[PDB]
């Protein structure tokens, strides 16, 4: 049984059923042209295409594509005839899913801060970020006292993080609530296959295995590894190790949906420390399969 | 001239730093590093940050690349800065 920092743990399986889930957010639909699907589909960057392959390899699941952006009526159109041309291809627009289960108020969040920052000697504290908070919690815009609506308005790498761990956090049922054709074989608590649109099945993937429940990508350049959110696996929605890095999103005032949301949640729920080996926690941790090549815009550009 | 450009990014960066840190791919672990030790000073952690980019990427760190990185991920009036403090 595998085990990190004094405890063991299962392989629990994720059954072959479970559906994967890509994400395609969008900051500047217009650079698509007229007639074609709003997702990056270029030689150097295949992504549609590598989705569309996915879904038809694995025929027996549903494949979601997370995806938001200012996409246009025509656009909208696309993504109905993508669907009605691939029958296990289910295309999910951030704004039509329910997240207010896990949101918070910003107000709350600056608030418990500064009374946290207070609680400090004045020698003690970041009296920076207590002038920040003050005068943050003065700016919030009206009707965004939210965290996820905070998140559903930003255009950089951070919107589609933070959106990929509550969408993964739904897992089975961000497919079920959807009512589309084909999702009614998945439950609710189901678990959930995410991937990156560069993550190439080859063949069908079968039963997964995580410790606990879990498991993500593992990045190793030179030697150095680091974990990842390129790939993650659940065998159930809401697994703990999100709901920890969700807290953490709540809490943490300069928190960073990869950094925080992710990687610290999954820490925690392992109780990681300063005082345990990094790589040991990545070899434990790590998701890898011999049917999936894995990040193969290492071979091309970071889209992003 | 890094420096300056440092400079800048410190005195205007605050809550939002991580962002940028990833936008630099500064790696997980360099992340709790800084965290661990500087756990009460936000600016700081944004400085430490921005010194182990300058480590990673040795020649390549050039406020060039840092400027490319704060448009990137969209923080345009630092970059806007940085990039009237060089000239
Ligand atoms: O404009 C973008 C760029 C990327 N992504 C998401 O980011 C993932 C990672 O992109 P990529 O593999 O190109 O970059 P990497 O992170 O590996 O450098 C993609 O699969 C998408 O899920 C996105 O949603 N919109
Ligand atoms: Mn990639």
């Known amino acids: 049984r595998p085990s990190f920092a004094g405890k063991e743990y299962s392989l629990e399986p994720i059954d072959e059923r479970t559906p994967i889930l890509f994400q395609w957010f969008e900051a500047r639909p217009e650079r698509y042209e007229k007639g074609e699907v709003p997702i990056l589909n270029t030689k150097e960057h295949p992504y549609l295409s590598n989705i569309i392959n996915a879904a038809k390899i694995e025929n027996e699941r549903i494949i979601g594509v997370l995806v938001d952006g200012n996409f246009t009526y025509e656009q909208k159109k696309e993504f109905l005839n993508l669907e009605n041309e691939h029958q296990n291809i289910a295309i999910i627009y951030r704004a039509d899913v329910d997240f207010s289960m896990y949101d918070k108020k910003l107000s709350d969040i600056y608030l418990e801060n500064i009374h946290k920052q207070e609680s400090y000697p004045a020698s003690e504290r970041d009296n920076y970020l207590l002038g920040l908070l003050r005068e943050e919690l003065k700016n919030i815009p009206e009707g965004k006292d939210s965290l996820i609506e905070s998140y559903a308005e930003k255009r950089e790498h951070t919107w589609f993080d933070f959106f990929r761990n509550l969408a993964i956090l739904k897992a089975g049922s961000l497919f079920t609530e959807t009512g589309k054709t084909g999702c009614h074989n998945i439950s609710p608590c189901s678990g959930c296959i995410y991937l990156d649109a560069d993550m190439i099945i080859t063949d069908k993937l079968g039963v997964l295995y995580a410790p606990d429940g879990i498991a993500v990508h593992v990045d190793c350049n030179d030697e150095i590894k680091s974990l990842e959110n390129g790939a993650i696996v659940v065998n159930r929605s809401n697994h703990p190790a999100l709901l920890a890095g969700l807290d953490i999103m709540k809490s943490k005032v300069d928190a960073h949906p990869y950094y925080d949301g992710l990687g610290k949640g999954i820490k925690r729920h392992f109780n990681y420390s300063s005082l345990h080996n990094y790589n040991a926690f990545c070899d434990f941790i790590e998701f890898k399969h011999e049917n999936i090549i894995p990040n193969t815009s290492m071979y091309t550009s970071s889209s992003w | ?87």
Not at chain 2, 3 to 27: H, P, T
Not at chain 2, 56 to 66: D, F, G, Q, R
């Open chain 2, 1 to 87: 001239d890094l420096c300056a450009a440092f400079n800048v990014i410190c005195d205007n960066v605050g809550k939002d730093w991580r962002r940028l840190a990833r936008q630099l791919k500064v790696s997980d672990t360099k992340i709790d590093s800084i965290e661990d030790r500087y756990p009460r000073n936000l600016t700081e952690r944004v400085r430490e940050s921005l010194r182990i980019w300058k480590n990673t990427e040795k020649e390549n760190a050039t406020v060039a690349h840092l400027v490319g990185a704060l448009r990137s991920c969209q923080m345009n009036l630092v970059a806007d800065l940085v990039q009237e403090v060089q000239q």
